[PDB]
Ligand SMILES: Nc1ncnc2c1ncn2[C@@H]1O[C@H](CSCC[C@H](N)C(=O)O)[C@@H](O)[C@H]1O
Ligand SMILES: Nc1ncnc2c1ncn2[C@@H]1O[C@H](CSCC[C@H](N)C(=O)O)[C@@H](O)[C@H]1O
Ligand SMILES: O=Cc1ccc(O)c(O)c1
Ligand SMILES: [Mg+2]
C-alpha cells in the first residue's frame with residue numbers, strides 16, 4: 208500500500224545488538240562457529256550478507272544451536288516458516304537424517320533461489336518441500352489434512368513477526384506432543400524490555416509490541432513449556448505438553 | 450593462609466543492559482520456576498558464594514534440553530546448593546537417576562530441604578568427593594548399558610578439559626555434555642584482561658584453551674550459547 212518506505216535502510220535497529228560486547232560476539236563466531244560451519248553455509252551467508260535484506264539473516268551461532276537441538280531430539284520431520292535465502296533451512300536439512308523431510312514456507316521464492324545452489328551442493332535438497340505462499344493459509348489447510356501419525360517434530364518460526372501468535376495457535380496442533388516450536392527474534396534488539404522505545408520505524412514498533420505480547424502469552428500458555436534463550440536476536444523454545 | 454578474596458567477577462550479565470536481563474527473568478523465567486527452585490535460589494543469593502549460582506534463565510534452558518532429548522540418566526559435576534541439580538531432577542521422569550558430585554556437601558545440605566519438599570530426592574545419588582577420581586573409577590566399572598544421557602559440568606573451571614576426556618567415554622553416543630561458564634563474564638574475548646583476581650585470570654586462560662579445544666575436537670559437535678555465563682553443548686559422535 209501507499210505510505211512510508213519499509214526497506215532495510217528505513218529501519219533503525221539493524222545494527223543494535225543484544226549482547227553488551229561486539230568483541231564477545233566476534234569471539235564466539237570466530238572460535239566456536241566458523242570452524243564448525245558447513246562450507247555451503249559459509250557461501251550462503253556471505254552472499255546473503257550483501258543482500259538488501261541481510262539483517263533478516265539468522266545468526267550463525269544460533270544456526271549451530273538450532274542444529275544441536277534437532278540432533279539431540281532426533282527430529283525427523285520439521286516445518287520452517289520463513290525461509291529467506293535458506294540459512295536456517297540448510298542448517299536444518301544438514302542436521303536431519305538422510306530420510307528426513309522439511310516443509311519450508313515463504314511468500315518469496317526468489318529469496319530461496321539465491322541459496323538453492325548452496326543447498327544443492329550440500330546434497331540435501333531432496334529433503335525439502337518448498338511452498339511459495341503465505342504461511343497462515345498453508346497451516347490452516349494442514350489442520351484439515353494432517354493425521355496424528357504425521358505431526359512434526361520441530362517447527363522454526365522466523366517469518367512476519369506480528370503473526371507469531373497466530374502461527375502459535377496452529378502449531379500447537381501441528382507439532383507432536385513433546386515436539387518443539389522455536390520462535391526467532393523474541394528479544395527484538397532488546398526493545399522488548401521497555402514499555403516505550405523512541406526512534407523506531409512503524410514496523411519495528413509493531414514488532415516490539417507484538418513480541419511483548421507474545422512473550423507474556425507464551426509464559427502463561429499451559430499447553431507448552433518454554434525457555435527463552437538470549438542467542439542471536441533472542442529465541443523462545445516451546446515444548447508441547449498436550 | 451591467614452598471613453596472605455576480593456574478586457572482580459560477581460554479577461552474571463552478558464546482555465546489553467540490566468533491563469534486558471531482568472526482563473527475561475521476570476517475563477519468561479520466574480513464572481515458570483518451580484516454587485522450591487525459587488526458595489532455593491532466594492536463600493542461595495544470601496550465601497557468601499552466591500556469584501557461583503547458575504543463572505536462572507540458563508537453568509530453565511537446561512530443563513528444556515533434558516526433556517527434548519528425553520534424558521533419563523544424567524551426571525552433574527559441581528552441585529553447590531543444588532539449583533541445577535534440582536532443575537535436572539524436576540525435569541527427568543519419575544524413574545530418572547542422577548549422579549551428583551561435589552567436594553563440599555555442606556553446600557548441598559543448604560538445598561536438600563527444597564529438593565526433599567519437591568519430592569525428587571529419590572532420584573539423586575550425591576557423592577562428596579573430587580570429581581576426577583570418581584570419573585576415573587567409573588571408567589573401570591561402568592558398562593555400555595549404564596552410560597549417561599547427559600552431563601552438566603559446573604565445577605572447578607581449570608579442570609574442564611580433564612573432565613572432557615572422561616565424559617566423552619561416560620556419556621553415550623548421541624548424548625550431551627554441557628559446560629557452564631565458557632564465556633567467563635565476557636573476559637574470554639580478549640587476549641589480555643586487566644584487574645582480574647589471579648584465580649579468575651587462570652579460569653579465563655583455561656576457558657580460552659578449552660573453547661579452542663572443543664571446537665577442534667572431532668569426537669563431538671558443539672554449540673556455544675550466549676546465555677547466562679555462556680554454555681557449550683557437546684554431542685558425542687563416537
Ligand atoms: N506472511 C508470510 N508467510 C510466509 N512467509 C513470510 C510471510 N511474511 C514474510 N515472510 C517471509 O519470512 C522471511 C523472514 S526472514 C527469515 C530468515 C531465514 N529463516 C534465515 O535463516 O535467515 C522472509 O523471507 C519473508 O519473505
Ligand atoms: N574438584 C572438584 N570436584 C567436584 N566438585 C568441585 C571440585 N572443585 C569445586 N567443586 C564444586 O563445584 C561447585 C561449583 S558452583 C556450581 C553451581 C551449581 N551447579 C548451581 O546450579 O548453581 C562448588 O560447589 C564446588 O564445591
Ligand atoms: O567460583 C566462582 C564461580 C562463578 C560463577 C560460576 O558460574 C561458577 O560456577 C563459579
Ligand atoms: Mg530471525
Ligand SMILES: [Mg+2]
Nearest residue numbers: 501603629630
Ligand atoms: Mg557456573
